[PDB]
Design a protein around this nucleic acid. Structure first.
Ligand SMILES: [Mg+2]
Ligand SMILES: [Mg+2]
Ligand SMILES: [Mg+2]
Ligand SMILES: [Mg+2]
Ligand SMILES: [Mg+2]
Ligand SMILES: [Mg+2]
Ligand SMILES: [Mg+2]
Ligand SMILES: [Mg+2]
Ligand SMILES: [Mg+2]
Ligand SMILES: [Mg+2]
Ligand SMILES: [Mg+2]
Ligand SMILES: [Mg+2]
Ligand SMILES: [Mg+2]
Ligand SMILES: [Mg+2]
Ligand SMILES: [Mg+2]
Ligand SMILES: [Mg+2]
Ligand SMILES: [Mg+2]
Ligand SMILES: [Mg+2]
Ligand SMILES: [Mg+2]
Ligand SMILES: [Mg+2]
Ligand SMILES: [Mg+2]
Ligand SMILES: [Mg+2]
Ligand SMILES: [Mg+2]
Ligand SMILES: [Mg+2]
Ligand SMILES: [Mg+2]
Ligand SMILES: [Mg+2]
Ligand SMILES: [Mg+2]
Ligand SMILES: [Mg+2]
Ligand SMILES: [Mg+2]
Ligand SMILES: [Mg+2]
Ligand SMILES: [Mg+2]
Lengths: 291, 170, 199, 190, 106, 128
RNA sequence: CAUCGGUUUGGAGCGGCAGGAUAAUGGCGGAGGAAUGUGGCACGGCUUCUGCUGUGUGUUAUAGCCUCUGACGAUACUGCCA
RNA sequence: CGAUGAUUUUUGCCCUGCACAUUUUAGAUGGAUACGAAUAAGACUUUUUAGUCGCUGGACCAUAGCAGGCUGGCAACGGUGCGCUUAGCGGAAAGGCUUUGUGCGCUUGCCGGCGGAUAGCAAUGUCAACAUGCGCGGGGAUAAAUCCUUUGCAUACGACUUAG
């Protein structure tokens, strides 16, 4: 027999499995599509979630009852010191997907980003990138040859940039290193832009303007193991239910003699990778600004 | 693969009738065992005679008179369908009377699902005059200076693989 | 009828199931087969019917866990692989070895871009189907069912055809020079004897 | 029945040079050239003379025979497209709301812009096909002239304009508003 | 001579079998270049060698041979039936055998 | 002009020479169907055959009336000298070379290899 | 390996004999006939008549075919060969 | 499945030449011999309406020498193998395709002298590429992770984010 009454399903089947994220750093799964006619520019930036605040703003929405009237809105602060460009990666269009051909690095790396490649920095000889730093041998023609290969064969160019986490109040000293796709211009223009920006700082005001709409990639808050009642928002069973009530009463019909993948089950809640879109930029503040 | 047979039979003589009339039929059969069987099948459709009360007098193959002269044959048929019994008339081009009949059995099997058991051959006639031809699908081959190519030739290969591109010219 | 070390088949113009059965029997009998240009394969019947066929295949999935069900591969090479694997005792060790004897590709990647590709007349679409019938190209059905790399393949195939055309232009010139050289050595003692021998 | 052979005769006027090779017809006339690929049909061509062409189907069944006179008609339409042109006249039909039609150019493309159709605030835009000429008739009120060498493009653009002006959620026997093809002729009058 | 072969190339295809039952005492062999029983009838009675390698040396050799002979043709495409002094092991399906030109009758 | 590319097919007509079984010549004397013809020749039996079993050659025996008997076919074949016309084509020459190759012995094959070595030496000298 | 004997599967196997409408055809000779009418002839459209071609006429002509037949000679097919 | 960093002073590692011995091989035993496109059309010289072709690869290249020995000559100044070397192209999985000069061979393109037996009338009568190990010889470099303590951006325990 059918359910006595119909009701929508609890939870979304498009965010499965509700498992922990593979990394704590949210990764850009997909970048904006490249337009050659645009100037060469970055498409992303890394920051740290500081906290929330409140603002008051005059609304410009004709036809609304709050038009030209003050509204009180929640806002989030993202601490964003300028990121340092340290590398460049070339990607090739293949019948099996994009494939990285070569990665070219900068000559000098700061200690906070060189700690990224170590689990025990204090016990190490800190040998990372020393022979590669030696690759800059005079003509540094190995580097120019690889960059020319990227220019010749790559169709997608992404830069390698890291945060300056020593400028944040965090006690962690490891920087966060990420790939940021370069959009705009020809492949040669992108490669020239990446090389000329090696070991240089790029600020947020060079990637995002105010009043822009941007997306946020992040790993959500972890809550550990959770029962179905709070993990999935299922109906609590009656107060007088034997063996407890924070359950789903029926987890399947008799046939198929298995539990379906669509049934809500207890498990780990939070710490998921999410891509959230259309967050408006109310302010791009500057650390040097005293106001 | 058929042959045309002349089968002659009669009722068994009685003291009342000591020379019964001799009746002949032209039978298209694969062999002489089926030729004498079909004879009795049709005589019992017409005459008060049986195989037990009759006698086969002669069985002879009837060969084509001019087996290398191209002819047009008209065949009159009476066949049984799934629903009723029907008369039909069809025309065939062939060099032997037997080879036109072989085509007829293939033809009613293919377009009407009429089995050998469901067909009576009423008459096979060679059409002497070009005006005697009633059917279009064989009249179109009686035009003067008939030419036509054979486009899209498919060649059967003895080998599985060929190292050059296939062609269909001809 | 010869045993080859590797047989590389150009899949253009081949009917999927006839080629699949022939290749299955080939790899079962110990012959190594590589099939290239699976995007140019053909299936008899119009495109819409085959799209409906793929949706019937897609309909089928394990109810209690979709990850256990049939894995509907969308690539032309993997469609051909499903056709062949349905024709192989693939759950035995012998069938697994036979499947190890086979390779299938879209386009013509290295090293096969500089080797000889053959055809299979018993499985060619232009020789089997009635000249009025409608057929499907597996590349369009694959794009229509989720395959993402059609335009990459056509860009790389035009690049390959440009290199192969330079190849052919060079071979014709050296073939032209050798024919002029073979004419000089005609009516010579070796040439006269070879004419009496049939050469 | 598998007819042994079927024929159709193209007629080439005096100033026209048809040119056929591998089922790609290129017809040249005073008004220009038009080409069409027929690789989806099995037909063969014989040049009878400079003014006539034989079009043959060998051993074709009923449907494959049906595809022969259509080839004849398409090539004849090509010939009259390069020797006389094509002209479709459309009349603007409205009961209450006048239809405001403009020939605009947006994004480097020509468009037919229909406004106020049945009072809608919506602005209808129809892309003008390549090789197709639009004109607002001066001699006639509420008339559009669609002209060009290719009959297929002209009639299909005209059909686009007619179809975009369909009436929804009403009795179309009563609400007869729309843009309809009123005259189908040629650039060169006969 | 760059070539030294004195045998005809063959392949071990199958045992004699129905849908479900196999007969190991007879192997079905495909002779290379043979496409008809008329072509295959040349090879009737010729002895056959399956040459393989083993871990242990026997008389200093790691190469072993199983000998057989052609008994009859099989089917219509020039395969033959063979009878070996020991049945060919099932792992050898698809392995190449050597079809000797003797006993010669040329 | 018009410049229409016409097909260069071989036609089914009275007088077409055909090959049968890669061995024997014959000519079509009358058409039976789309599939069957009546063929005759000096070295073949006058018979009704299917067109799938024969191959049309590019040669037509000129002025052969439809339905001509064996004597007429032989007479016109001799007059038109069809055997010589056939024997001059590359098709028959390739067939003859195939038969001749098939009749070689091992010693003749060794001589073929040696002569090929000599001619290849001369050809390479010519190419340089 | 040879040879034998028993059983058995074959060859592009080879030959002789018998039967039939004592095959039917075909080929040769003769007689007759017609048309999907060869040559020729009469009107035409494109050709310096460059298989030019279309329509008429009529009966071997600068092709042939059909029917009947006279005297030979084969083959297919089916059996037998101790 | 890809790019990239560092890769153990440990008698431990990498790269490389030879040499040897072993285990493995879904099964070497002359050569996987490269346009594209159409098929009611193609392909060659050409260049396109002309000649010729297909009607299968029963083709093409290679193929002689104690599994191919020891020596000599001639004709040509070519062919081929290997080793250095010059330059270029190839990123779809390029790992290959070309190329300059040089040195060392071979050449069956042609002609000579010498050798093979006894493995006994067959017995695969043992000749290949992948892998690993080991001796010499040569170029090169000289790390990390985990436990622990700690953290709480994490957490039932594992695991995870930090720091030492
Ligand atoms: Mg219920
Ligand atoms: Mg319900
Ligand atoms: Mg639902
Ligand atoms: Mg996640
Ligand atoms: Mg993406
Ligand atoms: Mg939830
Ligand atoms: Mg209660
Ligand atoms: Mg209770
Ligand atoms: Mg019929
Ligand atoms: Mg080819
Ligand atoms: Mg499918
Ligand atoms: Mg198996
Ligand atoms: Mg998906
Ligand atoms: Mg309605
Ligand atoms: Mg209403
Ligand atoms: Mg048995
Ligand atoms: Mg004859
Ligand atoms: Mg005894
Ligand atoms: Mg015996
Ligand atoms: Mg016997
Ligand atoms: Mg006799
Ligand atoms: Mg007679
Ligand atoms: Mg007379
Ligand atoms: Mg006349
Ligand atoms: Mg007999
Ligand atoms: Mg082996
Ligand atoms: Mg070569
Ligand atoms: Mg070749
Ligand atoms: Mg020497
Ligand atoms: Mg070895
Ligand atoms: Mg401590």
């Amino acid at each position: 027999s059918h359910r006595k009454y119909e009701a929508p399903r609890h939870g979304s089947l498009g965010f499965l499995p509700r498992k922990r994220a593979a990394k704590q750093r949210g990764r850009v799964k997909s970048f904006p599509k490249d337009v050659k006619s645009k100037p060469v520019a970055l498409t992303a930036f890394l920051g740290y979630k500081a906290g929330m605040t409140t603002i008051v703003r005059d609304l410009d929405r004709p036809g609304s009852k709050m038009h030209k009237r003050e509204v009180v809105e929640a806002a989030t602060v993202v601490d964003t010191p300028p990121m340092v460009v340290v590398g460049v990666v070339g990607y090739v269009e293949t019948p099996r997907g994009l494939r990285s051909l070569t990665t070219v690095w900068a000559e000098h790396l700061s200690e906070e980003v060189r700690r990224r490649f170590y689990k025990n920095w204090y016990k190490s000889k800190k040998k990372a990138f020393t022979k590669y730093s030696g690759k800059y041998a005079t003509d540094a023609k190995q580097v120019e040859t690889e960059l020319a290969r990227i220019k010749k064969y790559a169709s997608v160019v992404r830069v390698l940039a890291h945060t300056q986490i020593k400028k944040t109040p965090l006690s962690q000293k490891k920087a966060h290193l990420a790939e940021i796709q370069i959009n705009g211009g020809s492949v040669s223009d992108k490669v020239d832009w990446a090389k000329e920006h090696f070991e240089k700082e790029v600020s947020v005001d060079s990637v995002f303007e105010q009043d822009e709409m941007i997306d946020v990639i992040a790993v959500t808050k972890g809550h550990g193991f959770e029962g179905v009642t709070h993990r999935w928002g299922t109906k609590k069973l009656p107060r007088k239910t034997h063996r407890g009530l924070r359950k789903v009463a029926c987890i399947g019909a008799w046939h198929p003699a298995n539990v379906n993948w669509t049934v809500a089950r207890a498990g780990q809640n939070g710490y998921h990778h999410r891509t959230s879109i259309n967050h408006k930029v109310y302010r791009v503040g500057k650390g040097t600004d005293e106001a | 693969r058929l042959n045309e047979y002349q089968v002659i039979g009669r009722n068994l003589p009685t003291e009342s009738v000591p020379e019964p009339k001799l009746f002949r039929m032209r039978i298209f059969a694969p062999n002489t065992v089926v030729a004498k069987s079909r004879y009795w099948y049709f005589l019992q459709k017409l005459h008060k005679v049986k195989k037990a009360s009759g006698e086969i007098v002669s069985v002879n193959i009837i060969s084509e008179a001019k087996p290398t002269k191209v002819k047009t044959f008209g065949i009159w048929l009476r066949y049984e369908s799934r629903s009723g019994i029907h008369n039909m008339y069809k025309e065939y081009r062939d060099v032997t009377r037997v080879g036109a009949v072989e085509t007829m059995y293939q033809d009613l099997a293919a377009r009407h699902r009429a089995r050998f058991r469901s067909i009576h051959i009423l008459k096979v006639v060679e059409l002497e005059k070009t005006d005697d031809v009633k059917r279009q699908y064989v009249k179109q081959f009686l035009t003067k200076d008939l030419k036509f190519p054979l486009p899209h030739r498919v060649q059967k290969s003895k080998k599985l693989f060929q190292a050059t591109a296939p062609t269909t010219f001809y | 009828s010869s045993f080859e070390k590797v047989v590389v088949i150009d899949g253009k113009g081949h009917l999927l199931g006839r080629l699949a059965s022939i290749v299955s029997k080939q790899i079962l009998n110990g012959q190594k087969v590589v099939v290239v240009r699976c995007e140019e394969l053909n299936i008899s019947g119009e495109f819409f019917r085959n799209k409906l066929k793929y949706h019937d295949y897609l309909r089928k999935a394990t109810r209690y866990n979709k990850k256990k069900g049939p894995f509907h591969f969308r690539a032309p090479s993997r469609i051909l692989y499903k056709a062949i694997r349905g024709m192989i005792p693939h759950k035995t060790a012998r069938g697994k070895a036979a499947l190890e004897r086979l390779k299938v590709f879209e386009g013509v990647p290295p090293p096969y871009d500089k080797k000889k590709r053959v055809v299979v007349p018993q499985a060619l679409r232009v020789l089997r189907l009635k000249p009025g019938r409608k057929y499907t190209t597996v590349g369009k059905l694959s794009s229509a069912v989720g395959w993402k790399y059609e335009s990459v393949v056509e860009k790389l195939e035009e690049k390959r055809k440009v290199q192969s055309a330079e190849y052919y232009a060079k071979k014709k010139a050296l073939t032209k020079k050798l024919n002029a050289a073979k004419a000089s050595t005609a009516e010579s003692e070796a040439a006269q004897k070879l004419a009496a021998f049939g050469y | 029945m598998k007819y042994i052979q079927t024929d159709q005769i193209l007629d080439i006027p005096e100033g026209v040079t048809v040119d056929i090779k591998a089922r790609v017809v290129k017809v040249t006339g005073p008004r220009g050239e038009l080409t069409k690929d027929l690789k989806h049909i099995d037909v063969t061509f014989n040049k009878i003379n400079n003014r006539a062409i034989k079009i043959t189907v060998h051993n074709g069944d009923r449907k494959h025979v049906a595809a022969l006179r259509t080839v004849k008609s398409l090539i004849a339409n090509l010939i009259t497209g390069v020797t006389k042109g094509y002209k479709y006249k459309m009349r603007f039909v409205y009961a209450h709301f006048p239809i405001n039609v403009n020939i605009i150019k947006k994004d480097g493309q020509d468009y037919v812009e229909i406004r106020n159709f049945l009072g809608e605030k919506r602005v209808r835009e129809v892309k003008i096909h390549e090789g197709v000429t639009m004109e607002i008739s001066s001699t006639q009120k509420d008339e559009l002239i669609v002209s060009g060498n290719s009959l297929e493009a002209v009639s299909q653009n005209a059909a686009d304009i007619q179809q975009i002006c369909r009436v929804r959620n009403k009795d179309i026997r009563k609400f007869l508003d729309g843009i309809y093809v009123s005259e189908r002729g040629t650039i060169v009058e006969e | 001579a760059e070539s030294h072969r004195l045998y005809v190339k063959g392949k071990h295809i199958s045992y004699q079998r129905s849908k479900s039952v196999t007969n190991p005492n007879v192997s079905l062999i495909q002779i290379e270049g043979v496409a008809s029983p008329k072509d295959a009838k040349f090879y009737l009675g010729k002895r056959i060698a399956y040459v393989y390698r083993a871990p242990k040396e026997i008389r200093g050799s790691k190469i072993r041979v199983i000998w057989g002979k052609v008994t009859r043709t099989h089917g219509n495409n020039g395969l033959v039936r063979a009878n070996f002094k020991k049945n060919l092991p099932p792992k050898t399906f698809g392995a190449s055998v050597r079809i000797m030109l003797y006993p010669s009758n040329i | 002009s018009s410049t229409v590319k016409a097909a260069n097919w071989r036609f089914v007509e009275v007088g077409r020479v055909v090959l049968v079984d890669n061995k024997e010549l014959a000519t079509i004397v009358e058409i039976i169907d789309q599939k069957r013809v009546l063929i005759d020749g000096p070295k073949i039996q006058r018979q009704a055959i299917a067109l799938a079993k024969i191959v049309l050659t590019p040669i037509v025996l000129p002025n052969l009336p439809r339905g001509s008997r064996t004597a007429t076919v032989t007479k016109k074949w001799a007059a038109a000298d069809i055997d010589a016309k056939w024997a001059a084509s590359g098709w028959a020459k390739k067939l003859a070379n195939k038969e001749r190759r098939s009749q070689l012995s091992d010693f003749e094959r060794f001589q073929v290899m040696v002569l090929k070595k000599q001619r290849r030496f001369a050809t390479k000298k010519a190419l340089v």
